[PDB]
Design a protein around this ligand. Structure first.
Ligand SMILES: COC1=C(OC)C(=O)C(C/C=C(\C)CC/C=C(\C)CC/C=C(\C)CC/C=C(\C)CC/C=C(/C)CC/C=C(/C)CC/C=C(\C)CC/C=C(\C)CC/C=C(\C)CCC=C(C)C)=C(C)C1=O
Ligand SMILES: CCCCCCCCCCCCCCCCCC(=O)OC[C@H](COP(=O)([O-])OCC[N+](C)(C)C)OC(=O)CCCCCCCCCCCCCCCCC
Ligand SMILES: CCCCCCCCCCC[C@H](O)CC(=O)SCCNC(=O)CCNC(=O)[C@H](O)C(C)(C)COP(=O)(O)O
Ligand code: SF4
Ligand code: SF4
Ligand code: SF4
Lengths: 155, 176, 115, 85, 115
């Protein structure tokens, strides 16, 4: 039946997307250091299929790791625009989540969500590299639960 | 006491210069560089098998905030507002009101995880060990609003991680 | 028979892969998405203005150097002649003149890049 | 061809007319901007700019404030390129 | 006491001269911003905004103040010239997303408790 065929196509495409999540080298602050430590041998992003890649044209997930300030927010929004779809935003740290320590400052965006649609909120100051890996795996399951071709079949 | 890190003049004996020319032509330190990486590939990798294998922690680890309670069942919090008055990020909001029994307990105890800095200052300030930073750190959420913790959510965390948090405090209270 | 059949196979396979790459993925395009990438912030505006290349001398003498290899390449068949003395003298003449050209460039700045 | 007070005057009147805040009928050779037309000094800035850009040469600020009415405008642009009737 | 150091100008006339040349630079610039920054507002729609910005602080009379805003406007021009401001930074001058605010007392009374 057509539903089974589109189901299997959904599983294949979602598996590819979740098993080759290519992130972006967009570290901003101390939350980037853990972003490096999970790339360090101990946790090693590489075994999970995730390999760092600059040039947003060839990346899927943006881990906004660090404080997002007013002077940088236009750059972050523009760079998010460069990403071809599908795209995902993982927010690392309290600063990139809702403001963190400098939530009441004059030149800090009170949450990265106000600029891009954040897909996964990873809490911490900074989050432990295990916690960030957990957030990435949660995003992976999110991609696994996508129903693109199913919705197309029931257009 | 100081040392000259790069103050070495190379010897100009015929043997020395022959060795330098051999290293230049027949790449020698380059071969050493290859050999080092060969030696480490043959070595054991350091990666752990997350999530089936977890990196080591300590009983002092700071994670998800949680409200504890006495063994009787009554909450430890008495709304003294030390944690709210000491939080560097002003992430705690407390509203108190005398309960029906008479004990002073928070009618609202909200901790904003999206604004928290996980310093642990609240758990030091608490005179009754009511608010603690639990061992949990894998509590990422898909939406922002789920990170704005209420009193009920914090009490649920306290009731859930109580087995771990009681042991962690038991193994660390003597240092404090 | 064989060589152009090959070449055709490669070019059609490549053009196909391009076609599936460009028609299947269901693209959604907007102006800021195709905006030029300049490490975030909007580019100053150029990408076609003159871009100075200081090895212009080096780049052009590459043309003469690569030209000489056309004279040089008949050697595998030139060795199998009955006049090895003349062939050896002429081959060494080419190589010595190339060495002289390279040395003249090296001494008279030449290979050194402009600033 | 060489051009004289006639061409300078007519180009001055033209590029003074394209201005919207200027009025078509109170516009005259004797129409001082402050007095007849009722403008601002900031408006005189683009009067003298509409002078310079179409007239080619730039006119500095040391002299721009002196030119306050179309005669002075035409006179100055006449003495610049040596117009002596 | 009543007499204090000057910044750049030594009278109101020189401060007005500096204001005049700053307006000169801005007025000459505006179409270059419209084209280079890929703005969608009309050229006049930026020149009148420059005029309005100049007219905003047209009430000041202390010379040193006038030199201070002359330097500040020069800095903003400097940012606008070498694409240091971006499209969003420039567009902030035209408060677009801001809903229009009321001026009569009756609407303010209807909308909230503010002066
Ligand atoms: C001082 O402060 C600092 C900060 O302070 C706040 C900072 O923030 C930052 C900034 C922060 C960062 C940069 C973050 C940290 C980043 C890192 C440490 C980087 C870590 C990187 C890694 C762990 C990964 C490195 C990568 C490696 C080792 C290898 C990569 C190589 C690859 C090959 C990857 C795979 C990619 C690709 C494209 C290959 C896959 C493609 C294929 C297999 C295609 C196959 C196709 C087919 C088979 C088709 C077959 C077709 C057939 C058969 C027929 C077709 C024909 C038809 C007709 C259809 C810095 C630097 C900083 O210093
Ligand atoms: C070898 C590869 C084999 C598998 C190829 C799968 C290709 C899938 C491309 C993406 C899905 C597009 C599709 O079929 O329908 C789009 C359908 C169209 O249905 P739709 O009406 O929801 O449109 C999607 C929403 N817009 C129009 C805004 C893009 O959408 C999706 O699948 C995503 C939801
Ligand atoms: C929007 C896109 C582009 C980007 C943004 C473009 C706008 C940027 C503006 C930056 C400059 C700044 O706002 C203003 C400044 O520095 S100084 C203004 C003039 N204020 C004074 O000099 C005080 C006294 N005022 C006067 O004396 C009269 O106003 C006048 C000068 C007209 C003389 O009149 P008289 O002669 O009639
Ligand atoms: S959330 Fe904490 S660790 Fe992350 S950038 Fe902000 S202050 Fe630094
Ligand atoms: S540990 Fe968290 S809740 Fe406690 S004071 Fe620090 S930031 Fe506030
Ligand atoms: S410091 Fe402890 S007892 Fe005091 S208000 Fe905070 S949680 Fe309650």
């Amino acid at each position: 039946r057509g539903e089974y065929v589109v189901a299997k196509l959904d599983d294949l495409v979602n598996w590819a997307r979740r098993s080759s999540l290519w992130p972006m080298t967009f570290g901003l602050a101390c939350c980037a250091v853990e972003m490096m430590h999970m790339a360090a041998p101990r946790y090693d992003m590489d075994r999970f299929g995730v390999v760092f890649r600059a040039s947003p044209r060839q990346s899927d997930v943006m881990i906004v790791a660090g404080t997002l300030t007013n002077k940088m927010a236009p750059a972050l929004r523009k760079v998010y625009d460069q990403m071809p779809e599908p795209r995902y935003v993982v927010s690392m740290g309290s600063c990139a989540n809702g403001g963190g320590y400098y939530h009441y400052s004059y030149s800090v965006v009170r949450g990265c969500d106000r600029i891009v649609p954040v897909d996964i909120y990873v809490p911490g100051c900074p989050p432990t590299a295990e916690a960030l890996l957990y957030g990435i795996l949660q995003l992976q399951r999110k991609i696994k639960r996508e129903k693109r071709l199913r919705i197309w079949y029931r257009r | 006491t100081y040392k000259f890190v790069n103050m070495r003049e190379p010897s100009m004996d015929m043997k020395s210069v022959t060795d330098r020319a051999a290293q230049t032509l027949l790449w020698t330190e380059l071969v050493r560089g290859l050999g080092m990486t060969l030696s480490y590939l043959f070595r054991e990798p350091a990666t752990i098998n997350y999530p089936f294998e977890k990196g080591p922690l300590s009983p002092r680890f700071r994670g998800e905030h949680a409200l504890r309670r006495y063994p009787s069942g009554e909450e430890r919090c008495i709304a003294c507002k030390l944690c709210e008055a000491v939080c560097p990020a002003q992430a705690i909001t407390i509203e108190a009101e005398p309960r029906a029994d008479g004990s002073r307990r928070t009618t609202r105890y909200d901790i904003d995880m999206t604004k928290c800095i996980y310093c642990g200052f609240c758990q030091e300030a608490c005179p009754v060990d009511a608010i603690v930073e639990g061992p949990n750190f894998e509590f990422s959420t898909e939406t922002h609003e789920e990170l704005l913790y209420n009193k009920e959510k914090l009490l649920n965390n306290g009731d859930k991680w109580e087995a771990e948090i009681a042991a962690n405090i038991q193994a660390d209270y003597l240092y404090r | 028979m064989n060589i152009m059949l090959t070449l055709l196979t490669n070019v059609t396979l490549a053009s196909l892969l391009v076609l599936i790459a460009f028609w299947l993925p269901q693209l959604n395009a907007y102006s800021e998405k195709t905006s030029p990438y300049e490490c975030g912030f909007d580019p100053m505006g150029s990408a076609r203005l003159p871009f100075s290349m200081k090895f212009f001398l080096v780049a052009i003498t590459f043309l003469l150097f690569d030209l000489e290899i056309a004279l040089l390449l008949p050697l595998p068949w030139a060795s199998q002649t009955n006049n090895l003395k003349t062939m050896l003298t002429m081959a060494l003449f080419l190589l010595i003149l190339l060495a002289a050209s390279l040395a003249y460039e090296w001494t008279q700045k030449g290979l050194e890049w402009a600033e | 061809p060489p051009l004289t007070l006639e061409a300078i005057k007519d180009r001055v009147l033209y590029v003074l007319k394209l201005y919207d805040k200027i009025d078509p009928e109170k516009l005259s050779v004797n129409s001082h901007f402050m007095k007849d037309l009722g403008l601002d000094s900031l408006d005189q800035v683009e009067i003298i700019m509409a002078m310079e850009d179409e007239f080619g040469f730039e006119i500095p600020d040391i002299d721009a404030e002196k030119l306050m009415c179309p005669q002075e405008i035409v006179d100055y642009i006449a003495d610049k390129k040596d117009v002596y009737e | 006491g009543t007499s204090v150091k000057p910044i750049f100008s030594r009278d109101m006339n020189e401060a007005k001269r500096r204001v005049r040349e700053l307006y000169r630079a801005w007025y000459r610039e505006v179409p270059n911003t419209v084209h280079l920054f890929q703005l969608d507002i009309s050229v006049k729609q930026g020149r009148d905004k420059v005029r309005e910005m100049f007219m905003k602080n047209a009430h000041v009379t202390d010379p040193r103040v006038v030199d201070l805003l002359v330097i500040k406007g020069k800095m903003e021009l400097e940012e606008t010239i070498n694409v240091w401001k971006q499209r969003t930074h420039i567009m902030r001058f035209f408060h677009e997303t801001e809903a229009p605010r009321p001026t009569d007392f009756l609407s303010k009374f209807y909308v909230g408790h503010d002066p």
